[PDB]
């Protein structure tokens, strides 16, 4: 450390608190700005585990957690390590979607870089305000898809943030290192131009070339400054941007969409586990969607991946998912739009065409029904019932965040199937106990399973661009955790408790990949591969801060 | 101007102004990108502070985000305190800092203030030289043994110099980074405390030895080295003993005063002369009687004696007016019970029956006004209110023990039980009382906060070097003439809190008036307009400019 | 963008402009009134110095003033040397470096490097962690024991690390701020220094345990461990017992190379090469006789060896065309004087007369090129010319000992005594010699001050991790490839000093295209157009902007 004095309590980054030793006290210019106590992280962590018990309101412990993020570092990730099963609903879905929803009313301190399109020409500049040198992830958002509660503008700051927060909670990933960047270019959210403490501009969202064009200005920006192989994470981007940003960058620059991608390898990941216990035959999936954008064609095309590398055709496995809408089911001459990814997945029309979703669980006979269209229980109890109806073990994927938008609930499903449904939700929901007292432990597929592991891989390997198949070895990796026990209790994924031990062993498997598929670009090429990523983990414990005085 | 820019003016919370920072600040002064886009006043900032506690319950966690503001945005927090001060009084201040200080440890996230520990001695200078701020003027000091009516709390007492000193700045506008809250850690005699994983003191019994004195010494002396030696140095809340050899063995050597003796005795007779003001008593038929002979009791006394001995009356026959009871029963001549020199002047010959119980004190010696200062609870029982509402025709009963929970009696038992007759202050605060006949009254609040911000502005101002106990009496006399009719007709006895800042600037300026006067100031050269002077002087809770100062050639 | 501002821009070196901070830049960061009214350009700036310059006298005089530029405005310093690098070589290098590094400790005013001593052992990592540049991609590396010719100068020797990254700039626009100069000090041998009072090392003898090699370890480690495995290492003036073991122990574990070994036999090589064009001599009839069998001697030699191997000889014919002759007489089989292991492949059979003297030496074996690697004086006697003169119509006379004193003859006594026959280089500069017949004769120096640059510049570039000794034959025929005919006519066997940027870089060019054609190169993606790869990545003498980005919404 290059300063002494105030400026180390001030710094959260360095602030230990009472946990400044006394030698670190004096020789640091410390003493009597502390109290005389000199307390352990041990004891700082019980204070914190203390003060949240007396509280209430999950936004309440949000605002309480992520205040300890911008006061003492160290200790915010060691109280999120203590139990982040726990604090996971409060610093991640559904709870962070609250704080996103009223960011402007909650606010204290700025957390990470804000671009706005009033900015373009001068993104460099910006980015150069950063007071870290050696940045290697960013995650972006421009708040317009944010959750399933729609265009949230700057509000959406508080996603890249949480995802930060995970990297570091989960994979090790160093803290000074994260970046999160929210692009400012307005909002269509009516109710946040006429709040007085939006943090955005009161404009309705550019949509004109100078969008774009500030996009690769951030782009260019941000690996001129820092590398090249910068990873960049898309998040909660609008669909249209979602999948042409992607594609656009994803050759030029180390970057993926944790939305499409991210969510593909968790989801995916979970249906290996369903068909581990169903052991069905690869010929009679009918795999449908519940929306049809960013998450419905990002798991749909792994789902097909992993089909080619285990069996069938491409266009065999294309026919086997379908796909409704708020519009209707996808077939061909439909008088609503379809996309060139929904190309794949629209069908010639069957006999009857499915008004409402139970109609199309009814007329297709699906075995897989998976919500992403973020518009509420749409997995209705008649909808559970006639999947219940059609299949010995229906699988039901309500992946839809926060809970509020999420198709149905972990009972709804299980209670309504008498306990044969296979389960995974988006948002976490607790155990069920039905009425003949077997509890059953819904899995939660959502993306924070993945993106730790992945970018602590693509990260250490200093990887340049990130294919789809890295995403298949996530998928295979993560289900190739999951124990007999766990998944005898219902569980699709490992349990929450144990998601660093996962995203470590995750990132690992698709080092191990990387490497024997020329994307790593880390000379040189290290032989234990599990020990290159584990002592290479960023650590909640305090250093010494004390200079190194010696001998003559 | 401003030495740094970058992350640092947002992390410093004497600079940061969160999205009040104009564009141009965050272009020249490389913030920009690190606030959000949005551009905020203060009165933006100030709105979302009120919405977020409008609505909070508890008044710890009101304390929590408040204090939490003075470590992020220190403008915004004296600006929100400014906004309404007597709704956030009783949370910033008695009783919920007593509450805060209670479990100061539970609650901690930042320290607020220097801490001088028993151990750090022989080398106090290098912690007084490791406090940031250059130009300290005042000191709000504690060991913890006293704080409030909650006794010994050691380094959990901190809680209130950080108190004391933020209403320097929000009644007096004294400049925050010239205000500078100590905490004297010698140990604690609370088990409790020192049971507790989260105290905060050295884990020790109070050291009562030498070394108590020659550290206490050797801080005066550290603090005066530095920062001068007219810096002033308020004592706040160090326990009947230590209070006054330390006031006396410094009070001509340094330029300091004790806050719970002298600051709380000017409060009291402020109270008493708006009291002479409705009632007229004739000066030879007053008679008070103390519950407690401690630093609030003996200050109250003293000051009571000057004015009576400045009205007329001679030293030794305004002694004879007042008696005072503490834990031990009435103070008279020859007693089981101990008598320090501080309480002779007041031990008188014992009256017919020696009463067990203060009420039988009441009954006995038929006092006019009733002053409270035990921090022993509900002592002023019904029936020690009926016997005063009985005996006196307009008694005055002064309930000052803080917090709520150890003062004598409430308002609403005041006004009740002597039928709205009483003439009534509190230490803390209450609110108005309306009776069965549909009066209101609307008690007024005798506590120290009245003086210690006005007079520690004029101290400051006017360079004075030691403070004589007539400054005090001069501060009295300064706050009860600028209550007004119509505040003496509610049953206020002080005015009221929301116009404590222009009331303390008020008693400033009459103080400077005084000092200058009586050649005690000496700051040169003596200012012809001294409200002017003073008023000029104040901080503002205004977010300053720190734009470079960019112009053509 | 600068993080810092005010007073600090203007006391490092690395930012401040003087007077060439715009009025902007002086009101934006706070320096408005601590610069004269006057604004200056670049230009205003160098003529300053340059009139200060032309009117000193003794060299040393100059090498302060000039070097002092560097700790007071980075910027011009550079722009300085880049006016006029021809002017300035004899100044800041060879040979007043040496002059300098005589008595560095008496002219001594601030350090301009990193130490690490013996008593710094187990803790170099530390130390490593103290230097204030984050982005190290370059380390010139001494330890004082083979400083020029001068040998033994401890401590003192640090000016050659200094003098060798200045040229890394001045030469490649390799980036100031990721150059390191280090020195070594294991203590020193030389007496003369162990008595001076201004000495800068410890007062020790040079240590020769394993100490010695676990510190020259532990300093590998600690570089490589903050800055990089790749971190280009350059060790300079080691002497020879350390030189070699420390190339082979490190040159295929770390991104190293031995610039008195492999830079030395680079430059000689492209003399040589540059001789053989005007002499055009048979491959099989070539003689060179060494005076020397040190680290240049051995380094030029296995060049020569593997440009004549790839020129059709065999490894056995090539050496056999190599005699080397040391202190103690030529070097052949079986003699009382040792023979380590790099200088048995040159160790022949005994001639008929074992000669005593160099000049006997001559007149046996009868070299059609004689190089001088001794730092020994003035050895190539006017007898051992004119023999060489006689001996061969076109003589090859490499003298390239360091400094000019030590010089085995001077460029005069060359061309004079050879009738201007002689092809000749020398290590330190000599000006242009007209003989009485009225022919000019300019000399070059073979001083590998002609190849570190270049090369250091490809292996950053390329991120290249190991030097193989293929690098520095690509960097010979590089080099000699721009030597123009019309230059080559006057008598120089390399491009003037004058062009010795465009020179470096063109190196760097033709290195970068070796190194990724060969799978050498680490740096993805391989760039298409290597020539603009180098150039567009030079660091440039030209002040930057430090303005903050000011624009409106
Ligand atoms: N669990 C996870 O890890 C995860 C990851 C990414 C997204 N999601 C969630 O998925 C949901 C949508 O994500 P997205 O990025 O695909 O959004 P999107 O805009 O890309 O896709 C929404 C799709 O759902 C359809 N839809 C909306 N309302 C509908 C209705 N009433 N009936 C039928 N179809 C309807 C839309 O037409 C559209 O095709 C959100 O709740 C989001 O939070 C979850
Ligand atoms: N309102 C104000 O401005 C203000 C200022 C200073 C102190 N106080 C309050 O006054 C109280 C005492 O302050 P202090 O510094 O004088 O304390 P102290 O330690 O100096 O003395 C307390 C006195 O009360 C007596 N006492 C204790 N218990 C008693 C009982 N049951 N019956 C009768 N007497 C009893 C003690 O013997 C002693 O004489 C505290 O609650 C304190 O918070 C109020
Ligand atoms: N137009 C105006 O408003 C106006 C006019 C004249 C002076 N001033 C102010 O007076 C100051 C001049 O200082 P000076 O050195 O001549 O001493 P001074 O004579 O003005 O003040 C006397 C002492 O009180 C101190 N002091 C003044 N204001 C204070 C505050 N708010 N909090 C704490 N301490 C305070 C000073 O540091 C000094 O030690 C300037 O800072 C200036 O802002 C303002
Ligand atoms: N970032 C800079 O600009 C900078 C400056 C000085 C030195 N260095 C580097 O320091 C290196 C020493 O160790 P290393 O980085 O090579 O280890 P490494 O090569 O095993 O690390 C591989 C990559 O992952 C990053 N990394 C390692 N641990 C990480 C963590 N916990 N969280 C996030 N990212 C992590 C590294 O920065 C590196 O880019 C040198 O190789 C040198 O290149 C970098
Ligand atoms: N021009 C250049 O680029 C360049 C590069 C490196 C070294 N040099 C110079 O070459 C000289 C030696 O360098 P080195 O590293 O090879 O030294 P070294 O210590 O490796 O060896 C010097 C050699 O010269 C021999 N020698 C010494 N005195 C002699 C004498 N009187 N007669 C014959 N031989 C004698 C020694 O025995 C030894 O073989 C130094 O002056 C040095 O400055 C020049
Ligand atoms: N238009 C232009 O002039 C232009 C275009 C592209 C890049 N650049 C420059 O290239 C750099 C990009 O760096 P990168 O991280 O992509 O590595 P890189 O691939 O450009 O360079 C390869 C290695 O050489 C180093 N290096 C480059 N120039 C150097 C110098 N002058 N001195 C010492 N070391 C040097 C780098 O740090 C890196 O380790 C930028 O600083 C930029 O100024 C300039
Ligand atoms: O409104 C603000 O800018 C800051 C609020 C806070 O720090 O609490
Ligand atoms: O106990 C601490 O040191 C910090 C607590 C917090 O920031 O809340
Ligand atoms: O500045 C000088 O000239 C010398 C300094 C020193 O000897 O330390
Ligand atoms: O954050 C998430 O849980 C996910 O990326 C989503 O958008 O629902
Ligand atoms: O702080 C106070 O209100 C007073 O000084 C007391 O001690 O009660
Ligand atoms: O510095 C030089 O010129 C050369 O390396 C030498 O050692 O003579
Ligand atoms: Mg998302
Ligand atoms: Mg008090
Ligand atoms: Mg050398």
């Not at 160290?74 to 996103?100: H, N, W």
């Not at 020409?121 to 305000?129: A, E, F, K, L, M």
């Not at 508080?158 to 927060?165: A, N, Q, S």
């Not at 991210?262 to 009918?286: D, F, Y």
Request: proline fraction near 5%; hydrophobic fraction near 40%.
């Amino acid at each position: 450390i290059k300063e002494k004095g105030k400026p180390l309590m001030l710094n959260p980054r360095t602030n230990k608190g009472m946990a400044f030793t006394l030698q670190e006290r004096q020789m640091l210019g410390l003493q009597g700005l502390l109290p005389p106590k000199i307390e352990t992280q041990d004891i700082q962590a019980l204070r914190f585990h203390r003060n949240l018990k007396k509280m209430t309101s999950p936004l309440e412990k949000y605002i309480y957690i992520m205040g300890i993020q911008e006061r003492n570092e160290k200790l915010f990730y060691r109280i999120l390590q203590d139990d982040i099963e726990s604090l996971m609903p409060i610093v991640y879905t559904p709870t962070v979607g609250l704080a996103c929803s009223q960011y402007g009313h909650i606010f204290r301190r700025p957390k990470g870089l804000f671009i706005s399109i009033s900015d373009r020409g001068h993104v460099r500049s910006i980015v150069d305000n950063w007071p870290e040198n050696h940045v290697k992830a960013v995650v972006v958002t421009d708040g317009e898809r944010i959750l399933g509660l729609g265009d949230l503008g700057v509000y959406g700051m508080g996603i890249p943030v949480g995802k930060l927060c995970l990297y570091t909670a989960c994979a090790g990933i160093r803290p000074d290192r994260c970046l999160p960047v929210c692009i400012d270019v307005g909002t269509d959210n009516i109710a946040l131009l006429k709040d007085p403490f939006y943090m955005g501009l009161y404009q309705k969202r550019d949509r004109t070339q100078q969008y774009d064009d500030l996009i690769d200005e951030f782009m260019k920006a941000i690996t001129d400054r820092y590398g090249r192989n910068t990873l960049i994470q898309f998040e909660d981007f609008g669909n249209h941007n979602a999948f042409r940003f992607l594609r656009k960058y994803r050759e030029k620059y180390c970057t993926f969409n944790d939305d499409i991608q991210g969510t593909a390898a968790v989801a995916l990941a979970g249906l290996l586990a369903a068909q581990k216990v169903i052991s069905k035959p690869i010929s009679e999936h009918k795999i449908l969607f519940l929306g049809a954008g960013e998450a419905a064609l990002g798991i749909a095309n792994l789902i097909v991946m992993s089909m080619v590398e285990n069996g069938l055709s491409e266009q065999e496995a294309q026919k086997k998912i379908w796909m409704f809408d708020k519009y209707g089911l996808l077939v061909k001459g439909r008088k609503a739009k379809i996309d060139s990814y929904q190309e794949p997945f629209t069908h010639s029309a069957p006999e009857s065409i499915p008004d409402t979703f139970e109609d199309a669980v009814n007329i297709l006979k699906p075995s897989t029904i998976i919500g992403v269209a973020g518009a509420g229980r749409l997995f209705t109890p008649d909808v559970i019932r006639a999947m219940a109806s059609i299949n010995e073990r229906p699988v039901i994927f309500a992946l839809s965040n926060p809970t509020a938008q999420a198709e149905c609930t972990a009972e709804e499903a299980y209670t309504l199937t008498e306990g044969r449904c296979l389960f995974a939700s988006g948002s976490p929901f607790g155990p069920v106990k039905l009425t003949d007292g077997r509890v059953f432990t819904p899995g939660q597929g959502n993306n924070v399973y993945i993106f730790p592991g992945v970018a602590l891989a693509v990260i250490l390997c200093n990887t340049w661009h990130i294919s789809d198949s890295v995403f298949l070895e996530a998928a295979k990796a993560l289900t190739s955790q999951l124990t007999d026990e766990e998944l005898a209790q219902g569980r699709l994924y490992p349990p929450l408790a144990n998601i660093q031990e996962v995203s470590i062993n995750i990132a690992i498997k698709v080092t191990e990949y990387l490497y024997a598929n020329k994307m790593a670009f880390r000379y040189p090429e290290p032989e234990d591969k599990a020990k290159y990523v584990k002592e290479r983990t960023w650590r909640s414990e305090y250093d010494s801060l004390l200079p190194d005085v010696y001998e003559w």
